[PDB]
């Protein structure tokens, strides 16, 4: 039977980028043609594989990661990027094999009073490894004196709100992103096009 890509693309609610969702897809026939010609996408970039070649390829597992970010930050979802999102929220490896798909979600994810449910990690001591997920809310220590879980000077909550408002310029508008990874192990493949 078919692979459940619509459960990812057509999801009503999306995860904050710091707590990005990942769907593991296995033991199914993937129909990439209908998937890529459904909605209209503002960003479609594939690395190490062509979108039309996927129907011919088989993979052990296919991962579909999804999250929401700002329009100005979509450029950071690509191999070899740096920035607050790539360093502290969602990082792709330098030899990434897959596709990055994004579309404007201003109608779904912005509110008249501002949507503060979507967050990103602002402070982190070190950069994330590729495909690493950090959901901690530990008070960030920016000085010599420890915080002991109490906010204060040099003691910052690690997450920051986006506050999406439908009239913002597109750089500040929310975008839903889906990243398709293609893991090729020396195991019997379960997902073919």
């Amino acid at each position: 039977n078919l692979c459940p890509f619509g459960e990812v693309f057509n999801a009503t609610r999306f995860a904050s980028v710091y707590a990005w969702n990942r769907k593991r897809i296995s033991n199914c026939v993937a129909d990439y043609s209908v998937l890529y010609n459904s909605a209209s996408f503002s960003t479609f970039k594939c690395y190490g594989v062509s979108p039309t070649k996927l129907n011919d390829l088989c993979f052990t597992n296919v991962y579909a990661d999804s999250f929401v970010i700002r329009g100005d930050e979509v450029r950071q979802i690509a191999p070899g990027q740096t920035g607050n999102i790539a360093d502290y929220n969602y990082k792709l490896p330098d030899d990434f094999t897959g596709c990055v798909i994004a579309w404007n979600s201003n109608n779904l994810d912005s509110k008249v009073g501002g949507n503060y449910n979507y967050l990103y990690r602002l402070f982190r001591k070190s950069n994330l490894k590729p495909f690493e997920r950090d959901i901690s809310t530990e008070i960030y220590q920016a000085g010599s004196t420890p915080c002991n879980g109490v906010e204060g000077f040099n003691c910052y909550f690690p997450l920051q709100s986006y506050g999406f408002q439908p009239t913002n310029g597109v750089g500040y508008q929310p975008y839903r992103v889906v990243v398709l990874s293609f893991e090729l192990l020396h195991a019997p493949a379960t997902v073919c096009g």
Partner: antibody
Amino acid sequence: EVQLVESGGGLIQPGGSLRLSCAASGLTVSSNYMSWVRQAPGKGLEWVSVIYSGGSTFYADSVKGRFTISRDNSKNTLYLQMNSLGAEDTAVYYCARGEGSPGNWFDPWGQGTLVTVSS
Amino acid sequence: DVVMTQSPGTLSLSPGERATLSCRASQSVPSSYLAWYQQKPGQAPRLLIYGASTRATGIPDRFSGSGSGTDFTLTISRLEPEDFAVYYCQHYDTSPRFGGGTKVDIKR
């Protein structure tokens, strides 16, 4: 007792290089967003570069390829290496913790140091 | 990428009056991205207001910021001689941006 004390300014000939220093007390340089902001005489404020606690660096287009921001953890000090200097680089250079963004504003600021590019 | 424009260039008010400083844009900018900085002669810039309207620590109450979308305002009630300075609005889109600044002169 939070302070950013700057040094390194002065005269430098066109095409030469110079290195500015921002010594911090009251905050850990390697743990923060740390920025350089400059101001040409009689003119406005211009952000120049930032270094993330995680190590990433970014530069304004006007200094890309010529400037290099860095830090020394054991000295708790921020640096700006300026190369290929020209008349447009004559300015007071400030350091600041932050990057002028939500939850991450420019605060505090160093007292600034004047760089004069002349022959 | 949003260009913000401050007005007027210079403001000349007697002490005790109310100073209104504007920072306008062509596109709407979320209020949480707006900040104001004060720079007195010879000194370094000082953060006055952040998040469009939140007063920075130790800033006197007579400074207040407001506005949203395309029109952000800094108000200085009960203007004092010490308030003589240049005030900059500031925001981040893809990099930190500073407005051109508004100079506040004080009549006497």
